[PDB]
Amino acid sequence: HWGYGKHNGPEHWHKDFPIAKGERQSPVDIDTHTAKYDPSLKPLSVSYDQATSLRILNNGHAFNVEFDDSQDKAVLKGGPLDGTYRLIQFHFHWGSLDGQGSEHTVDKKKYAAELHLVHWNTKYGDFGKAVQQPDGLAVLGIFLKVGSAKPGLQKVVDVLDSIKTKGKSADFTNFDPRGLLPESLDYWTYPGSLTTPPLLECVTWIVLKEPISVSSEQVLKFRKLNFNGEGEPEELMVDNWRPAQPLKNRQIKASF
Ligand SMILES: CCN[C@H]1CN(CCOCC)S(=O)(=O)c2sc(S(N)(=O)=O)cc21
Numbered sequence: 001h002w003g004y005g006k007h008n009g010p011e012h013w014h015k016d017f018p019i020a021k022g023e024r025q026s027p028v029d030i031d032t033h034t035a036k037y038d039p040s041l042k043p044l045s046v047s048y049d050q051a052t053s054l055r056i057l058n059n060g061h062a063f064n065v066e067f068d069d070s071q072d073k074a075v076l077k078g079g080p081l082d083g084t085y086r087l088i089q090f091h092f093h094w095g096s097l098d099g100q101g102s103e104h105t106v107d108k109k110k111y112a113a114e115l116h117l118v119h120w121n122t123k124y125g126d127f128g129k130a131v132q133q134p135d136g137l138a139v140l141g142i143f144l145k146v147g148s149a150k151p152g153l154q155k156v157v158d159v160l161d162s163i164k165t166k167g168k169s170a171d172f173t174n175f176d177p178r179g180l181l182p183e184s185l186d187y188w189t190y191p192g193s194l195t196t197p198p199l200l201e202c203v204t205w206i207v208l209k210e211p212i213s214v215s216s217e218q219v220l221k222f223r224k225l226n227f228n229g230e231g232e233p234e235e236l237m238v239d240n241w242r243p244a245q246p247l248k249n250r251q252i253k254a255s256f
Pocket residue numbers: 059061089116118128131139193194195196197198
């Protein structure tokens with residue numbers, strides 16, 4: 001079934017998820033010169049102080065850190081959003097080399113990886129309902145460049161040993177996701193989709209302008225995970241990123 005390999009990669013997904021060819025597919029290239037500065041855009045409000053992480057999991061596609069989304073603990077509001085969106089999980093997409101890995105590109109520049117903090121609109125009751133809605137999800141996207149070490153990422157890097165193969169999970173309580181945020185919360189926003197199957201066109205994408213840097217040692221560790229389950233032939237989990245999609249009559253708005 002789907003993946004990122006020659007035989008089941010992005011170029012094939014349309015055969016089972018026809019929406020892959022739709023009107024607001026993600027990721028896209030942010031062309032800085034034609035993005036419209038919008039002054040009606042409010043600041044983001046990220047309230048991650050009371051977030052409760054529970055578990056990290058290798059799901060065969062990436063590793064996800066999941067959060068308890070039963071009460072308004074970590075929420076995103078403001079920006080292009082109306083309403084409150086709950087953090088349910090975060091994951092990354094990364095490359096096999098440092099000059100690729102981001103899904104979204106900025107003027108065709110690709111970053112080493114990209115963090116997605118997935119949120120769902122609480123007005124819809126539960127996550128599974130939010131994914132049937134045009135404005136059901138908001139994903140906060142953060143570019144990562146190789147440079148200095150990010151202190152708050154180390155905690156995630158250490159556990160990766162425990163979850164090397166598909167289907168393994170480790171408990172991962174008390175992680176503060178605030179340690180993954182940049183200094184500036186300036187962003188670009190546009191309406192788009194999930195970048196993995198089922199490729200649903202449910203998302204307001206908030207892509208922050210400022211990257212976080214991680215060391216090559218940290219993102220190296222990402223590259224040692226496996227797409228395979230235990231006892232299957234080993235395939236290193238790298239390049240789990242979808243290429244940019246045509247913007248097809250959408251306008252990327254900028255808060256700056
Ligand atoms: C491996 C599948 N990843 C999916 C899993 N999604 C659930 C989809 O099915 C709901 C019925 S999700 O909302 O958690 C989600 S957000 C992103 S991304 N890259 O666009 O930030 C991918 C995915």
